[PDB]
Amino acid sequence: KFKKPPINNPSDDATIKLAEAAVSVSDSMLEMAKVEKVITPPSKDNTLTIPNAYNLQARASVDWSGPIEELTARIAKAAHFRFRVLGKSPSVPVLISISTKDESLAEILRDIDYQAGKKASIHVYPNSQVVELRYAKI
Amino acid sequence: FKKPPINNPSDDATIKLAEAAVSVSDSMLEMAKVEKVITPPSKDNTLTIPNAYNLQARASVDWSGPIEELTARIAKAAHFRFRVLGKSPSVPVLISISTKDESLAEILRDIDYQAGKKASIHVYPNSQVVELRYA
Amino acid sequence: RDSKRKIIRDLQKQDIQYVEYGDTRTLIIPTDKYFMFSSPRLNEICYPGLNNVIRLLNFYPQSTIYVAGFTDNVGSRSHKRKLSQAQAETMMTFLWANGIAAKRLKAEGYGDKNAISDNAIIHGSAQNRRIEIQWF
Amino acid sequence: AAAAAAAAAAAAAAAAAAAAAAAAAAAAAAAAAAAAAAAAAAAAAAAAAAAAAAAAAAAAAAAAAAAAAAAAAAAAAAAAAAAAAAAAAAAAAAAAAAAAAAAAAAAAAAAAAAAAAAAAAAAAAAAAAAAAAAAAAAAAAAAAAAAAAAAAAAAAAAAAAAAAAAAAAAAAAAAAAAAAAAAAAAAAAAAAAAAAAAAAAAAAAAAAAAAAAAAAAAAAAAAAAAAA
Amino acid sequence: AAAAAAAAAAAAAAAAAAAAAAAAAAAAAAAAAAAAAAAAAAAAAAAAAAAA
Amino acid sequence: RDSKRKIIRDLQKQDIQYVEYGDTRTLIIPTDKYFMFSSPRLNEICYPGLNNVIRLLNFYPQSTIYVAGFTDNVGSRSHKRKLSQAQAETMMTFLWANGIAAKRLKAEGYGDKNAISDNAIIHGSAQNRRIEIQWF
Amino acid sequence: LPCRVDGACDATIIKMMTDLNKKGIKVASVGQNYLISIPASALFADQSPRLNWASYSLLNEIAAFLKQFRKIAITVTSYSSKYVSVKRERALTLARSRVVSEYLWSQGVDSRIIFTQGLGSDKPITSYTLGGDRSPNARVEITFRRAV
Amino acid sequence: LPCRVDGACDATIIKMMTDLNKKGIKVASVGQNYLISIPASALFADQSPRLNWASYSLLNEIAAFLKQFRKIAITVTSYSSKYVSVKRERALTLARSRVVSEYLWSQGVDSRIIFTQGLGSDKPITSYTLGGDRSPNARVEITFRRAV
């Protein structure tokens, strides 16, 4: 009896050609991130403007696709941080879509800050207990 | 006894689609790490909370319009003097705050934020004066 | 029924390859069914493959153990290397924690740099995602 | 039977008898001082091949390199060793100061062993039922087999760690690149998140990664390190 | 109360237990700090940690 | 037929919730059927719920009693607070006048600041209008 | 056509709710806040962040009960009795809750967030402090609000 | 019409693969890397670059097995145990592999390249070094990758 090891499920040609498009999308994506992070070096984190805290070291697990307001209000509510916004929200929504797995609330807000690039920013003030969300000035 | 996950990539093409999804989503996050211009809170330029007891009153305001009338009215709601330094342009600096209960110094914080650099707010709490500067 | 031919016949049944090769003996374990997805968490539902592979290598109690991890073409080369290294390293800790002495073992991760199939096709890249276990 | 002098004795494989209260400070080059009682030595020496053994009431303070250390009943050392150490104890207490390279340490009794600097390559520590080892600078491959009802506390920043606790032991580890943990009815506390971590727990066994929440920047568990 | 090494910017520290790394380019050899067991050698000039 | 399981079974029948929770025991009483409307006048026709709740808390004669009142989103925040405070306060006087000693009791009114459902839907706001009775 | 039932029935909701209360997993149902309270004896080993193998069946009707509701954020929080220290205890309960939420989003929830955290007996439901995981204080609780 | 089978069937592939493993020519099948390993007793005379006449039947189901796959480059490499020197040995194994690849492209391969080379026991699969061509180290190996 002869057998190769991975005997998976039957896939169909829909996901076969979706997968072999998706890998070249991912390939072009990673080389663009390569050229971009070498053409301007990222000097700075966002861990100084979102610093971690005790009772921000709880963990969360998120899939989400809506606007940033309800998500950051829910993170701050379960962080026991009071939540505010600075700046009015734009008429087009700043839409994030977080789908990540078992990371702490401080890195949740750091990735929310990153995915709302130049449209919003999350700031956390941890000697106070406030998560704020600042909109852009445009 | 266990189960595998329900939407699990247990399938030889859907595994490749999903690890492509992991590679595109992390590489999007380092694109965000390189383009995300921040400024540190050492040099953030925005107002503090000036921690006086009259400023930690809980207020509520629904408004869009020109900055000097709100901060005049937050000064007389806070029992503070309102000074203005500089010249208002005849296109007015326009704000909007619609909040239904919140804190009064934080008002003065997101007026300073929604002003940006068209105007700015200082609070001197020993003098019990707020002031609005133009540029 | 407790012997070599029995346990290799049911590792054929729960789809792990074995090769006899002179002194070199190598198990090829698919990461896709023996790991939860893109993680160094072992696929805990597939414990009888893990008990049967450690039941197989009680039979060779003096051989040094090479364990190596493999990916396919997706991701950055750093992600390939650290994911293959993490999966090989946690299979190495599984064998150490199921009772092989730690200086027999060697965990090493290749970001598909040996590449037993091409990554251009689906089933071939599924064969590329693996753990090799060599010993003498 | 005292011997307290600063000279060049320099050739003494001295297996002394009881009440040999030798507080010598002599230049003992080819030295092996296997005293049997009452040693109260506070020297500034240089040995470089010392296979020292010490029985009861041995308080010492030395700046000499050793090669092996043996403890018998009860002691209090403060030594500055340099090169290699084969150490074994019995119900005693010991402290060492300078940069050592302890390859193997087997403690089968109540041993309060401390080393303020251990810069080794493969430190294999086997523990049995009573001891308390606290050795912390920097290893490169730690193998902590606590077969023990005992404790192995560490802030030793090891590059690779392999800690197995067998029956209500308690081990505090810190792994830089590789964390390997097996616990059985016991506790293994991970004080630093490794670059790749793997921990397996047996019956009633706790491999709890007890790092201090609210660090200055506590690094989160990434995609290569998120184990359950 | 540290103990530096002669190589490129390594230093042990014996407040409780540390083996951290400096930079050795700004040369903050103050030999006076508040060393803690949370990877923080807070010197007179700046702060140093176990580098990675 | 005179006991705990009987009286909790008919408080289920006249639609008052009870929760067993460790030492904390809490009755949830709807103000909509146990008060006449938007008033601190008790719904006098629904006396057997009131006798049955006081018959239940004769069983715990040393516990301190927290009583708290709840509204929904309508009205001013002052009206929310004073109406919830008035209804909790008169349920506190009902328990005091049916014979619990006054330093066991604590009346406090929340203008839906705990909010066990959303006020955006009808049946959910009906569940929000309540009195909680906690004791230890 | 639009769907009448959303993959769930109310008879099955109360059937699982009676069966979970018969096996001692207490389901509180306040408003739309749902609480299922699980003793840590009924899932883990004592003072360990490790599941028993039989307790994933208990997690099976926990997850199949959590199929039935439209929900936005489940929060899962764990706390036990004192064993060594509160720091070791909070590390235990954080690992405890994150392990059970890792299995719950391995299984089927239609939640968008699971928040997950652990506390150091900071909220204990009885003053009687018998032991380790056999204490009724030693428990995980899964609370959510059923959306619309 | 386009062809379904390309002059080959999978039943015949595994039929030859069982028959070659029964006659001791061991077929390893890793990914699409195929290895057939042939002991040098089973083809040649001892320490010689010369085929026996009966061993072309062994080469017949080797070549009819190599009919069945789409392949780009077969590499055939031979090595035996030590006889005089490594220089005489490498001349032997180079002549050995080039003789068997001359017969294999006399026969039917659809390969585009056969690379062919010999080594001087530089890669031996056991440490047990009994003799000459009766050693299991003394072997030729035919490795390729099956294209698509």
d(Cα H102, Cα H74) in Å, to the nearest integer?
12
Q: Could you tell me if A23 lies within 8 Å of chain C, comparing CB atoms?
A: yes
D131 near D150, Cβ under 8 Å? yes
Q: Kindly list the partner chains of chain A, i.e. chains with 3 or more CB atom pairs below 8 Å.
A: B, C, D, G, H
Helix axes F77-97, F47-56, angle to 10 degrees: 70
* Whole-number Cα distances in Å, C104 to B79, G14, H126: 78, 56, 19
CA atoms within 13 A on the CB side of B103: 17
Structure tokens at H13: 């592939």
Q: Could you tell me if A6 lies within 8 Å of chain C, comparing CB atoms?
A: yes
Name residues 77-136 of chain A within 8 A of G (Cβ). 78, 101-102, 105
Nearest CA-CA partner of D197 in D184, D205, D208: D208
Structure tokens at H30: 């890793």
d(Cα E44, Cα E29) in Å, to the nearest integer?
9
Query: What is the separation of C-alpha G22 from the centre of its chain, rounded to a whole number of angstroms?
Result: 16
- Edge-to-edge order in the sheet of strand F17-21: F17-21, F24-30, F130-135, F65-70, F105-110
- What are the backbone dihedrals phi and psi of residue D174, each rounded to the nearest 5 degrees, phi first? -150, 110
Which residues on adjacent β-strands are paired with residue F107? F67
CB-based contact A2 H29, cutoff 8 Å: yes
d(Cα B89, Cα B72) in Å, to the nearest integer?
17
d(Cα H134, Cα H120) in Å, to the nearest integer?
16
The beta-carbon neighbor of G117 closest among A59, A62, A75 is A59
Find all residues with CB under 8 Å of G122, minimum gap 6, and list them: G79
Find all residues with CB under 8 Å of H5, minimum gap 6, and list them: none
D166 near D144, Cβ under 8 Å? no
d(Cα F81, Cα F113) in Å, to the nearest integer?
10
User: What dihedral do alpha carbons G82, G87, G88, G91 form, nearest 10°?
Assistant: 110
Residue C31: Cβ-neighbour burial (10 angstroms; 0-12, 13-18, 19+): buried
Quoted resolution (Å): 3.5
The residue numbers preceding gaps of C to N over 2.5 A in chain F are none
d(Cα H127, Cα H129) in Å, to the nearest integer?
6
The label of the residue with tokens 């997950």 reads G116
Using alpha carbons only, what angle is made at residue F56 by residues F50 and F58, rounded to the nearest 5 degrees?
105
F92 near F66, Cβ under 8 Å? no
Supply the DSSP symbol for B41.
G
Rounded to the nearest angstrom, the minimum Cα separation between G26 and chain F is 9
| Helices within chain B (DSSP H only) | 14-35, 67-77, 104-115
d(Cα D202, Cα D187) in Å, to the nearest integer?
11
The beta-carbon neighbor of A30 closest among B27, B37, B46 is B27
End-to-end CA, chain C:
25
d(Cα F97, Cα G31) in Å, to the nearest integer?
30
Residue type at G56? Answer: Y
Nearest CA-CA partner of A105 in G75, E40, B31, D189: G75
d(Cα G72, Cα C120) in Å, to the nearest integer?
40
d(Cα A137, Cα A118) in Å, to the nearest integer?
10
Using alpha carbons only, what angle is made at residue F11 by residues F8 and F16, rounded to the nearest 5 degrees?
120
Query: What is the separation of C-alpha G90 from the centre of its chain, rounded to a whole number of angstroms?
Result: 17
Kindly state the helix (H) or strand (E) to which residue C90 belongs, with its residue range. Answer: helix C77-97
d(Cα A70, Cα B28) in Å, to the nearest integer?
23
Structure tokens at H37: 């390993």
CB-based contact C89 D178, cutoff 8 Å: yes
Name residues 43-62 of chain C within 8 A of D (Cβ). none
d(Cα G63, Cα H102) in Å, to the nearest integer?
66
CB pairs under 8 A between A and D: 20
Q: Tell me what percent of chain G is helix, strand and coil, each rounded to the nearest 5.
A: 30, 25, 45
d(Cα E2, Cα D40) in Å, to the nearest integer?
29
Q: Could you tell me if C19 lies within 8 Å of chain H, comparing CB atoms?
A: yes
Test mutation, C112, C122, C130, chain A, max A CBs within 10 A? C122
Find, in chain B, the residue whose alpha carbon is nearest to that of G104: B5
- Count CB atoms within 10 A of the CB of residue A89: 15
d(Cα F8, Cα F49) in Å, to the nearest integer?
11
Q: Tell me what percent of chain C is helix, strand and coil, each rounded to the nearest 5.
A: 40, 25, 35
The beta-carbon neighbor of A78 closest among G94, G101, G115 is G115
- Count CB atoms within 10 A of the CB of residue A71: 23
- Edge-to-edge order in the sheet of strand D50-54: D34-35, D50-54, D66-71, D85-89, D102-107, D123-127, D142-146, D158-165, D175-183, D196-201
d(Cα F71, Cα F82) in Å, to the nearest integer?
10
d(Cα H99, Cα H91) in Å, to the nearest integer?
12
Using alpha carbons only, what angle is made at residue G21 by residues G17 and G26, rounded to the nearest 5 degrees?
100
CB-based contact B3 G60, cutoff 8 Å: yes
How many residues make up chain F in this entry?
136
Q: Could you tell me if F75 lies within 8 Å of chain G, comparing CB atoms?
A: no
D117 near D101, Cβ under 8 Å? no
d(Cα A20, Cα A137) in Å, to the nearest integer?
41
Q: Dump the DSSP string for F6-67.
A: HHHHHHHHTT-EEEEETTEEEEEEEHHHHBSTTSSSB-GGGHHHHHHHHHHTTS-TT--EEE
Nearest CA-CA partner of C106 in C130, C127, C136, C73: C136
Rounded to the nearest angstrom, the minimum Cα separation between E3 and chain D is 10
d(Cα D15, Cα B50) in Å, to the nearest integer?
76
B82 near B131, Cβ under 8 Å? yes
Supply the DSSP symbol for G67.
T
D102 near D83, Cβ under 8 Å? no
A92 near B9, Cβ under 8 Å? no
Structure tokens at E26: 């700004």
d(Cα H143, Cα H73) in Å, to the nearest integer?
9
Query: What is the separation of C-alpha D118 from the centre of its chain, rounded to a whole number of angstroms?
Result: 8
d(Cα D41, Cα D24) in Å, to the nearest integer?
6
D150 near D166, Cβ under 8 Å? no
How many residues make up chain A in this entry?
138
Test mutation, H25, H26, H30, H145, chain C, max C CBs within 10 A? H30
d(Cα G138, Cα G124) in Å, to the nearest integer?
8
Query: What is the separation of C-alpha F10 from the centre of its chain, rounded to a whole number of angstroms?
Result: 16
Q: Are strands C24-30 and C17-21 parallel, antiparallel or unpaired?
A: antiparallel
Find all residues with CB under 8 Å of G114, minimum gap 6, and list them: A60, A61, G73, G74, G75, G76, G101, G104, G105
Structure tokens at B70: 């709100």
Q: Give the torsion sign (CA, H86, H91, H96, H98).
A: positive
CB-based contact G53 B5, cutoff 8 Å: no
Query: What is the separation of C-alpha A88 from the centre of its chain, rounded to a whole number of angstroms?
Result: 22
